């Protein structure tokens, strides 16, 4: 399962998969 946002300072990342 993904996230939904997370990422805080990251960068999101491949949420779709």
Same mark, same amino acid.
């Given at each position: 399962?993904? =996230?939904? +946002?997370? =990422? @805080? +300072?990251?960068? @999101? =990342?491949? +949420? =779709? +998969?």
């Amino acid at each position: 399962k993904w =996230y939904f +946002r997370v =990422y @805080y +300072r990251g960068i @999101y =990342y491949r +949420r =779709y +998969r």
